[PDB]
Amino acid sequence: SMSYTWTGALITPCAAEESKLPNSLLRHHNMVYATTSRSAGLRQKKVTFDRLQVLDDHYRDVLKEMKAKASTVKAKLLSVEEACKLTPPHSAKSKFGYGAKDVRNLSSKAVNHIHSVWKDLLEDTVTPIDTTIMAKNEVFCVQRKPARLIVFPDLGVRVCEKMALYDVVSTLPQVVMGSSYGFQYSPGQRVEFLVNTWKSKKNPMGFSYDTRCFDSTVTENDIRVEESIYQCCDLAPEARQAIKSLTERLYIGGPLTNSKGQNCGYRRCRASGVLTTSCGNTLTCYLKASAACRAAKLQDCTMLVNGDDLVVICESAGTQEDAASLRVFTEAMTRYSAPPGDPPQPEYDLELITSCSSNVSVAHDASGKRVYYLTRDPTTPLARAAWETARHTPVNSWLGNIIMYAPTLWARMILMTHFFSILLAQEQLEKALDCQIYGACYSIEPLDLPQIIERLHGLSAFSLHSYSPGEINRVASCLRKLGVPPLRVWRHRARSVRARLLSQGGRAATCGKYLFNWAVKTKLKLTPIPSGWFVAGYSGGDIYH
Amino acid sequence: SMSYTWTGALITPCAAEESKLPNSLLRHHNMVYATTSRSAGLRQKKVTFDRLQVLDDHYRDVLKEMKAKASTVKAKLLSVEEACKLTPPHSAKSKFGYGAKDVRNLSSKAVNHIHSVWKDLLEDTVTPIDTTIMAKNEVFCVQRKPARLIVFPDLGVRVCEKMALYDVVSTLPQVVMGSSYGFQYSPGQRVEFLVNTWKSKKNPMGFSYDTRCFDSTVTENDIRVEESIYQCCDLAPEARQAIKSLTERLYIGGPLTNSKGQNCGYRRCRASGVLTTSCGNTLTCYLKASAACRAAKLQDCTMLVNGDDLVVICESAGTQEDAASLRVFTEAMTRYSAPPGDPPQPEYDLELITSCSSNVSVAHDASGKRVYYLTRDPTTPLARAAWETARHTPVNSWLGNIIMYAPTLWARMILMTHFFSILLAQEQLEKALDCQIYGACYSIEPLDLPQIIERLHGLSAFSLHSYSPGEINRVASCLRKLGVPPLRVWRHRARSVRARLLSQGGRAATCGKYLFNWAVKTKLKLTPISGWFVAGYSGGDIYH
Amino acid sequence: SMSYTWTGALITPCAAEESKLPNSLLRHHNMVYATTSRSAGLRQKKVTFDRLQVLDDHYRDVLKEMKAKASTVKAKLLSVEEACKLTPPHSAKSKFGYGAKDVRNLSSKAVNHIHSVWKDLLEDTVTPIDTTIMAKNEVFCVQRKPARLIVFPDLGVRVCEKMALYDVVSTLPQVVMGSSYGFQYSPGQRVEFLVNTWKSKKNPMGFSYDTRCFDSTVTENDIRVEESIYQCCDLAPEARQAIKSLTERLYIGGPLTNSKGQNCGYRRCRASGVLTTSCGNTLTCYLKASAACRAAKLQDCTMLVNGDDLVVICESAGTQEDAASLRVFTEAMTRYSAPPGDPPQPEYDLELITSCSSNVSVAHDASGKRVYYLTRDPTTPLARAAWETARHTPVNSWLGNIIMYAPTLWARMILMTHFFSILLAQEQLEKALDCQIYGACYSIEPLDLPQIIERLHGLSAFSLHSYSPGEINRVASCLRKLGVPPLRVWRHRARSVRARLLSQGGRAATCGKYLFNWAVKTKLKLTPIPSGWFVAGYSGGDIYH
Ligand SMILES: N#C[C@@H](c1ccccc1)N1CCOCC1
Ligand SMILES: N#C[C@H](c1ccccc1)N1CCOCC1
Ligand SMILES: N#C[C@H](c1ccccc1)N1CCOCC1
């Protein structure tokens, strides 16, 4: 069918939308933009087309294999009270007279409506269910991207999605996909996995495969196959009936409605803003790709999947032959409706493989031993931190990034230094902040950062010191490019923060001592001190813990 | 959405379409025409429109109750062997190099292609499945109907439809609509049920509701709802998959390709020529009508549904209040996408209510006792009868009409006397013949008719004798209109046929003795001597 | 025993080998390639391996039956003069100071040497006879093939083989194998056999069986048994004594000597370039398959064998039951050391069965009567055709293909038109040409094709006109893939050649009249224009008539 059809009504904004940035961090303010509903039209062009999908014997085998694992999963029905407790406090309110705050409180009004929505789900497996369609606001750096289209149903239905399916998507993918299921690895765990599966090959080749607007390429067929996988589980028969109802009334497709209530058209592909999107996209991506591997006769593949993001490490057969089999892979995926964005290429050096906008690099600890850590190009993190420090938002990428990339040269020198300067100047070190980790919202005290980092990365995160050349150049140019002070300047700033932190004692002094030992010259001795976080992807799924 | 979209390509025939008749039976040959593909555009016009559909609590309540019943129903997957055996010997061949004969014979080629269609049905629940669109050649009398459009898929698909849904459509409607499922009634049992439910009311009113081109009014929503009722059954897991997939790729709509292989357009409404049409149409009618009854506050409603055909008998609230309530019933049925053709009218006389082109009337048996029988206007039967005698057709509507209308003045005196005459004059009494009964093709030996008619109608079918005045006139009027000899001539022809038959002894002598006892003058004292009326299968490509 | 063992010395070329085309016929010149010695190593990997062979009662029953049939056969020794006459004029020279030209001229130096090779064969039944190993230069279209490994003995030995065994391989296979011996059929007779035996089954099923590099799977045992089948015949005493010597000293194996005189290794399987290779392979293949049929319990098997190529046609026992008996069949062939390449599949459509790279299809003649004929995918003949026009070969596969496939849509419109146009351009219509029919080399005058075709295929061949949808589409997509112009262009090109041919009168007129009556619109009433070619197979046996 067609991924989308449009009525003509605009995708409309909920309020203002600031396209630009109103400085101690970065001087080239004109390189940072937010996407807006103004670029919506362009996105609608890039994301709408017909979908011709040709399956083959490889697709069916993998699927059979996947169904066999899915059949050993038992999963439970979440109560109204449990599914309420999972809704964020600022989730988008219902059009039926209650908000997320009512839900969280178990108000008998919300709860009665949730009951009613579930009962209709049980009673009617046909009528499409309404979604809202909005354009995302994300900050990026110049050299432009159109806004991405978020699509999601009413809060009533989302609490119902939780009840039917939260336990399935928290549990199944890991079993179905084993070590290929990305969202079970902390950053350190993901480096240990990739590094070890690299050295396990006689002669390793790796590639990341970029799919071209993946949610568009997900066919309604893909989504029923995904349902049959869910249905293999040992389910309660009432969950079984809402999982059917949901996939046919919501996941497969539906109408699109803008913020002003007008009808914008119709979707017959993946909505980003529903509970099954991460799990669904992950499964679908691993299915097609496993098959593409088999089609291209690739040797001893190990895969790692996170939603629409795929990496494959395998046994090379030579540069000529690798490059050719990679094009055979690409056809396989195309035939499966997962065509290429940037066409994929063989890498023979782990460091240069990018997956989940991240890559492996090495550095050394206090004792000199080489340590491998996860990193990324810091442009977007810096840009967003700049945006975050200028315009107050209730979402904190900087903090997520400090947690996720704590060992990195840039997170420690720039991000840690910068914001600990702000919190200290504003007397708000104590105050909890909300950050995203695998699409899930957690409330986090910035003063706990030392424990958190020790726990996810070991003490070495506090003492890494001979970063690789290619990493050091990456960061330096990013800094020159953005107009952020060179690294010598942040060392001097960090010493200032470290000292101010130490004078406050306790948790505050432990941040200074640990997060900033890299800046002192004479190091102190850093000793041990004294998480269902890295288990499953929930991005798009309206989750809070 | 639009029931049909047309590309502009014509609807094409396979062959020569006779339209006019090329005299024993009727003399006014120019009154009888046969529909052809020349009339198709006029039909295309009538059957293509937008459907605005809107449901309410009544609809929804009735659906809940319907599902509850379906849930009590086990149904099983037919094997390829069982499904092959159900295929008519003369069913349109597959475009994949085999025919019904190959199917019927378990040709491993036919069987292996069926296995391949089944497997694709399982992997793929979205790609529309190709149908072929044809204009129907039906025969009529004047005062002019344009051809109906038959729409159907390839034989491979059809066998898969049987594997998946033959047990459901043969079993689900009766459980779900109890006394309303019309196809559980032989013609004698249909009459009994109408008469008793009429007599059981304190003060009865009735109406039949003519839906304007029902097939086109069936929305893609209606067809999915039907699919969801089926799924309430306890079904094998491979059946469940083949049903959804069949409904999404076939039932719900898909491309229309003519006989020359060109795209005519796209369908988003009921297909006339699939296994589920009768069942679907019946359920979908029962659902809309049951709720419409509630919307109109109809007291003590009893209903009879045969696909798109509907009859309601209920308690009267007074003349005035009935008409008003009928108009409410119509309003509802319109919201639900079943606007009327001829708007419904209240009737206080059962013998004036028409349903499945038929009506109850009354006659008296040997003893004097009054018996109720089903009749109709004989115009179309006599038309097709004459057409069947001039041009050899593989279908025999005369036999079916003798079977379904054995007790009628017109079938007894004309159809029996005419064709038993012809059969005699060609030494073909032994030869089995193919006739349709609730859409299914059965082979029947005409010499068996006495045992069959007794079983289906009773001994009294061989001695009904004081037909109502209205009935006698309709028959006689129609005789004058069509130019077919009056009933006194047929009486004479019958004594002659009866004699010849009596002289052959055997089964032939029993036909003589029983089928034409009406004609003798001095009667003989007549003494005594299946699984046919259980479910509907028009469109379904079915044989036993 | 290892099919081959290798010293390490390479397989080397005689002249320098083209691998690429230097366009009237096809634009996509980079899709056409020739195999060269560059790929000898890739082949070497594929064809060298160990043979576990195990036999059973079914194998023995069938061998017994075979020897009984062969015991009814007489066969005579060929004179030297007879044997010399069968030697093609461009057959590789002897390394004992004479050539094929000398052989054909009955020179006393050649004849004296042939007597001495014979005298030594009679006396010595053990000393392995020298062979020469070479890489074959065959043309193909992409979608890569390593070259095949042609291996052959000295010309002296070859003339001796013809003396001993020519009469035997020309006559024995037929008697032994009966209706199964494939090389006894014209292409039209093969078509009639496949068709009639298909229609002779109540409920038919067929399969072809591809054997993983058959020459390599032939064990020394097989080649000895094969020998013992020959010894059943009534044979002159010296025929017997030479047949044993040849089978122990040359057929069983022996050393491999490259074109430079070095030792490449040693062979313990079938040699492609000896006289008994067609007859042996056909027997061995027939013997194993006949037994496997019985192992699998196939009902009413009708078998057709051409060397390593096998098709079986039998009564279907149902689909699951059919699928299973092939697996049983495959297991048996494997025990017997003839494992599969592509595993066999059941087929219920005669036109979808390929055998000898060919399938049956249907057209209609002058009268509209339906008529059966033999065809193939034209990709490979089109490719070899391109090549034979761009570069001068002494082997004209285009002429082979016109004779073999006169009735075909693609042969008539493209091969006929195209080559008759070139012969016309170059004033060479009168000039005899060498072509290979069943591996025997014939010199054929191209103006004789209208008689040759009438005899071999009937007048229907000159007027077939409603080729099946499947056959039309295969020919169409091949034109596109290969870049050859569409059939409308060949119609017009054919009318031109047809006119020019009619103007010359004589036999040139007759070709234009008949061969091209398809391009004319108003046709001529074609009427009758006023062989020992399809008896046995000699592919590999150095044979000329
Ligand atoms: N940073 C970050 C996370 C991530 C964040 C949000 C959604 C999905 C992933 N990222 C690193 C670990 O592997 C996955 C990619
Ligand atoms: N009542 C009833 C049946 C019937 C038969 C077939 C389809 C629907 C109804 N009856 C009317 C028309 O044909 C024969 C007599
Ligand atoms: N059947 C047959 C022959 C054949 C010829 C030569 C060797 C084996 C088989 N066929 C395919 C290849 O050449 C011409 C047509």
Side-chain angles (χ1 to χ4, degrees), chain A residues 182-183 185-187 190 304 306-307 309 355-358 374-376 400-401 403-405 436-440 534 537-539:
Chain A
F183 298 116
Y185 303 110
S186 79
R190 188 203 178 78
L304 192 56
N306 302 70
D309 194 303
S355 61
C356 291
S357 334
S358 310
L374 202 79
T375 187
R376 59 163 287 144
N401 286 310
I403 292 162
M404 295 292 294
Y405 300 100
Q436 299 288 94
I437 300 164
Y438 294 166
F534 295 118
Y538 299 104
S539 105

Side-chain angles (χ1 to χ4, degrees), chain C residues 182-183 185-187 190 306-307 309 355-358 374 376 400-401 404-405 436-439 534 537 539:
Chain C
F183 295 106
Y185 300 109
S186 111
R190 180 199 181 73
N306 303 78
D309 200 297
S355 72
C356 309
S357 319
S358 304
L374 201 70
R376 52 171 299 151
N401 283 332
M404 302 302 290
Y405 304 94
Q436 302 292 124
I437 299 172
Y438 289 180
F534 297 112
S539 196

Side-chain angles (χ1 to χ4, degrees), chain B residues 333-390 392-394:
Chain B
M333 288 292 290
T334 304
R335 297 191 282 289
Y336 303 161
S337 183
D342 315 325
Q345 82 171 116
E347 290 289 330
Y348 302 102
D349 182 343
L350 183 57
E351 297 170 26
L352 293 175
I353 297 183
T354 300
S355 48
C356 312
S357 321
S358 329
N359 74 261
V360 173
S361 174
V362 50
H364 296 86
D365 74 22
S367 132
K369 203 182 196 300
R370 92 211 314 254
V371 175
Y372 295 94
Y373 68 104
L374 206 73
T375 179
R376 55 170 283 150
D377 190 310
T379 297
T380 288
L382 299 168
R384 302 191 163 155
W387 182 286
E388 268 139 49
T389 84
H392 186 279
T393 54

Side-chain angles (χ1 to χ4, degrees), chain C residues 63 164 218 405 411 423 425 444 470:
Chain C
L63 178 57
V218 169
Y405 304 94
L423 285 172
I444 269 166

